[PDB]
Amino acid sequence: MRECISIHVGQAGVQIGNACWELYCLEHGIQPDGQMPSDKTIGGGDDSFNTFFSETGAGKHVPRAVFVDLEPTVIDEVRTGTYRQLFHPEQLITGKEDAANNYARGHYTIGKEIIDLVLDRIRKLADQCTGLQGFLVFHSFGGGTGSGFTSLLMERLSVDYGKKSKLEFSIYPAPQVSTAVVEPYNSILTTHTTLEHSDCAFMVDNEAIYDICRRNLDIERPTYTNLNRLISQIVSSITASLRFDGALNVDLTEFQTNLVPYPRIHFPLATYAPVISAEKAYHEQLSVAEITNACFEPANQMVKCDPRHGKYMACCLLYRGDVVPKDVNAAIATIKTKRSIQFVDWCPTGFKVGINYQPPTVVPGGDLAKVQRAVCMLSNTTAIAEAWARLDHKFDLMYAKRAFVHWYVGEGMEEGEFSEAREDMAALEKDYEEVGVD
Amino acid sequence: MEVIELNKCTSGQSFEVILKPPSDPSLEEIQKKLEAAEERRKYQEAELLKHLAE
Amino acid sequence: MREIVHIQAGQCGNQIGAKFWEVISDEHGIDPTGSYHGDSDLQLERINVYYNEATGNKYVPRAILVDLEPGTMDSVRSGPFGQIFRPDNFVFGQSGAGNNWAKGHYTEGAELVDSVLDVVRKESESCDCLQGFQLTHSLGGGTGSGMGTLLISKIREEYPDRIMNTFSVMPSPKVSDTVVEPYNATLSVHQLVENTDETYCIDNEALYDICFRTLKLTTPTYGDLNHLVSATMSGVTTCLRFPGQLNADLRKLAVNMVPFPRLHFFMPGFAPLTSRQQYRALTVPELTQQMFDSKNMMAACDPRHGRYLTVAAIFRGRMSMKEVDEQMLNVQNKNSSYFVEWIPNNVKTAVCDIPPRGLKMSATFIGNSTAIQELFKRISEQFTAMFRRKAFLHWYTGEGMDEMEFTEAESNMNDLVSEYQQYQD
Amino acid sequence: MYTFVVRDENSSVYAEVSRLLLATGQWKRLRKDNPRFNLMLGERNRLPFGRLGHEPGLVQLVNYYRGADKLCRKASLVKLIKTSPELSESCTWFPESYVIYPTNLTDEREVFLAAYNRRREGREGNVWIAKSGILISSEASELLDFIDVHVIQKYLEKPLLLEPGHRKFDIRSWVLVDHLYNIYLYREGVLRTSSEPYNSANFQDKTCHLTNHCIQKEYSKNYGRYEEGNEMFFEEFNQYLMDALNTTLENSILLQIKHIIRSCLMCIEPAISTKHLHYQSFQLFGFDFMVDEELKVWLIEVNGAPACAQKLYAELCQGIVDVAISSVFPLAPTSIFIKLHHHH
């Protein structure tokens, strides 16, 4: 067994962290007081769930998580929420005033004065791991903390934890659920300094999460709660292989091996189905072929884009519920004949499949309905580069006039770092086009 | 349409299907970048205090 | 705990600030004696932003009242909520400022500023984490204009990394005390261009036109004009005083509203504005059409004569947030030729469930429009009509100032206009 | 009050649609870089599809199907036909084609010479045409040496000729596809005819073999003799078929044209449809057909950015606004199109 330390940075990271650990405890049968009746080894053991939880002599199962926020308001809910008993104070680190949506402020100005404290708290969790695998970092692109402090934390983790893998769960900026205007600057800034420090990163576009909530759940105007509960279903499906008995994606290293042949192209697209409204009368349970067939519809992708006009480098199919290998192959055959799945010529045209019999657990009273079988597809598509083009374009509209640039230079950043980060994205977009287009 | 490496346990199983075959900054340089920016904030605030002194 | 220190200087400053603490005091449930008697926990959620908590659950506004003559502040202390303020926080001289910027900035004010700053420092030292300051004043008078800008200069010297926020009444000949108001406003404007992060421009002419034309009030008074300012100040501060998914603090609002350091002068707006046909329900659409109508804006500038850099809108009241989004997206997509196309999504919307007093729902408009240059054009035009003859200059040169300083302020403003002009194209 | 942008100043087709949109008083034009648009008339090459459909509260529409280049490129069309089981390499309405890359750069050089030597041995007509500047020759040496991406396809040695004149010609039909993927064929076609008698002895002079409107109006000596601008419309061409051949344009030619369009568009619908995309698409097409002396129709090429005949600019453009634009952005017949129903 080997441990996995989760790090949540900024508001979006902290709240999404709540939606996940809330779900993890419901899946592993852990109560808010941290007790687990099904665990027979008291205060010890190297089970599969022990990769995300530690155990005390009193039988408490404590997450391997560190919540960092430059403002205490969002973390303070955690100190008093329903799962307050799970964590201890050392795990929750809060500053006094945030980063004002300013990458420079989170990276340089404020970040310098709290980075050694985080590392010390993170080091305190590493000293409990008998074989640390790496870190999962949850954060937003647009936040000044999510972007500015994350990229600094990654630069240091790569120093203090060289051979350890680092996965990201990033939130792509969407205008519908954000009042910030400089999120393009922050996103492109953090992607530049973070690129060489992350082995694999899953991007979620709030625009995608938003319309899934309005379209499938009939939430006219979703809240952050509705968005996070859904986002944790996807995150639970991706991390499940690490928390349950299995053979596919058994440790963080297997994520880069199975999903990223080329280093800089480590942004897999994620697709999920089915998402059914709990307020619904009663839905006809979908077959293994109908849910699998949905993984190739733009509607339920974590980032709106057209995979038809890209090229796949890898592909995983994670199933949960009543599913067997016989049904998976049958569905796949029917799709290759109808769809347009263009693989790159230097990668095998195949799919790795992982089935977990326990169906997706749902938060009581949540928006999602209980299903008997669900799947989440991870696919490395050049089509996701569309997201970069969108964001790079917005960046270019503001930088041409140098709008808002002074807020960053005023916190110690050099104006050159902009064009430096932008030239990097330009090369990133180029690498994508070199791999997909003819 | 082949199914290789089929692993079955109690809580599920995992396999692979092939359809077609194919055809950092040191701790010294990060403190310099940080301090280099803290130095540019000091210089800027000086020109503001010098301005206010005048 | 993100605290704001409020400062009101001069006659206009204190009378507007006076009503302001009267309007929000009612919204948070604080009576004239400082006792809370509301009914919702949301009222106390962010109460420490503007109020200090004394003994016995008493809430004392974190405000400093400043003036160079006792006349106006004796009125506040005897006003409706006058007893709520901290006795010490009243700092005042006796000579007055005689509607003279030089007296407020160099002579009379220079003799009292150190003692005003001694109070500011006492309010800050008690703040767990001070966001920044907000000043209410006029620019056409002597104290709030000259001494006010003097305070801002000195506050920034002691708190260089805090947000300086001001409500500045701009002088208009149609609502004029003395003829030197262009002189005082041109001098203060340069101070704000240098030492403020956000300046809500409130033109007394727009306030007058609103009371006459839209509000149907034969002959207005300064009190009538101040009700509008109160209602507006109440609005643009809902983000800070009540909860919501926004989570707005002063520096965050600056970073999203100001794309360029010196172009931080906003055009505020309010809606509805109904004459006493006042009991009619107002649909979200109506709220939005008026909120963008120039007649509901206090800048006395026609927004159709410039381009919006950024826009912020706050909606108060239990309404359809889905319908709020639809109507906002409509105004943008029906007039996108008035918004700059090189700043994506430069229009944001925050909701709030607690409506102002006696209104089912409302909307407060915050525009960073290049049309505001028309305002600085008027002030500059009136300035030069007099400075080209040195008319009334003796009031200032007799206080220590030279003509060279007046020329600098002239070119400083003309520069500020050229800056707004290159961004309108 | 809908809004649209224009990013192709060289488009004669949509230049009139934009004029009609503004003439309705309900469509407002924006600058070619303003993203708050309901309708984009995008550029030919490198149109940024990825940036469409991400503006909250705006249903965006574009006049190009992403991926249609698979059908409008010379080599793309051939590869699509020989690989897509819907069409098969044995397709009966598309000339035997081959993809050939210049030797300074897969490549079907040998596959061409095989069928070439097979024909040269059978006495059959072995004249081919190379294109991507066109060369027609009966020798494989000249065709290959000329290319040194191009395509060699069997040249139709027995094309249908008109009388009087004994001249060649081609056919152009305009096809519109709306966001719903309904396939509308314009009832009005045109025949770009040759003003020179067809001569099979010498393929050196390419003025009587090529029916391009530019070549005839530049290198032909009878431009405009038999018809105005070398363009005969479906009414006159239909009367001719009845007086000489005793058949109609519908039964003899139009049935095949309507079949080829369906087969091509149905084939790629899974790859370009916008039925579930975050934006909607529609595109105008211009198919070019050949007609042999047996009244069998062949597919030459498909144009993705075609122009229209002068006399038919008003009727068609208005039809584009009715079934393509207004069908998505309604305003406040006897449809001029012939719907080709199909299974989606």
Ligand SMILES: Nc1nc2c(ncn2[C@@H]2O[C@H](COP(=O)(O)OP(=O)(O)OP(=O)(O)O)[C@@H](O)[C@H]2O)c(=O)[nH]1
């Ligand atoms: N999906 C999702 N997105 C969120 C959530 N919270 C914030 N965001 C997004 O994050 C972006 C803003 O970044 P924040 O996380 O709020 O900022 P921060 O990391 O706390 O850094 P500061 O600027 O110091 O506050 C916006 O685009 C929000 O839409 C959340 O709970 N769920």
Ligand SMILES: Nc1ncnc2c1ncn2[C@@H]1O[C@H](COP(=O)(O)OP(=O)(O)CP(=O)(O)O)[C@@H](O)[C@H]1O
């Ligand atoms: N295999 C073939 N047999 C007979 N004629 C042919 C032919 N290939 C091409 N042509 C002639 O060439 C003309 C079409 O050329 P082609 O379409 O390849 O070039 P092009 O695409 O630049 C013309 P356009 O795009 O305007 O239709 C037709 O008029 C046709 O008569």
Ligand SMILES: Nc1nc2c(ncn2[C@@H]2O[C@H](COP(=O)(O)OP(=O)(O)O)[C@@H](O)[C@H]2O)c(=O)[nH]1
């Ligand atoms: N809106 C408003 N403006 C005022 C009020 N009192 C004065 N003014 C304006 O402020 C300018 C004069 O400033 P004033 O406050 O009298 O000078 P000071 O007291 O010495 O600082 C004039 O243009 C007045 O029109 C008021 O109560 N409300």
Ligand SMILES: CNS(=O)(=O)c1ccccc1Cl
């Ligand atoms: C314009 N007439 S007025 O509104 O009576 C007025 C005049 C001068 C100063 C203040 C006021 Cl309110």
Ligand SMILES: [Ca+2]
């Ligand atoms: Ca155990």
Ligand SMILES: [Ca+2]
């Ligand atoms: Ca590394």
Ligand SMILES: [Ca+2]
């Ligand atoms: Ca004195």
Ligand SMILES: [Mg+2]
């Ligand atoms: Mg924050």
Ligand SMILES: [Mg+2]
């Ligand atoms: Mg006065």
Ligand SMILES: [Mg+2]
């Ligand atoms: Mg062509």
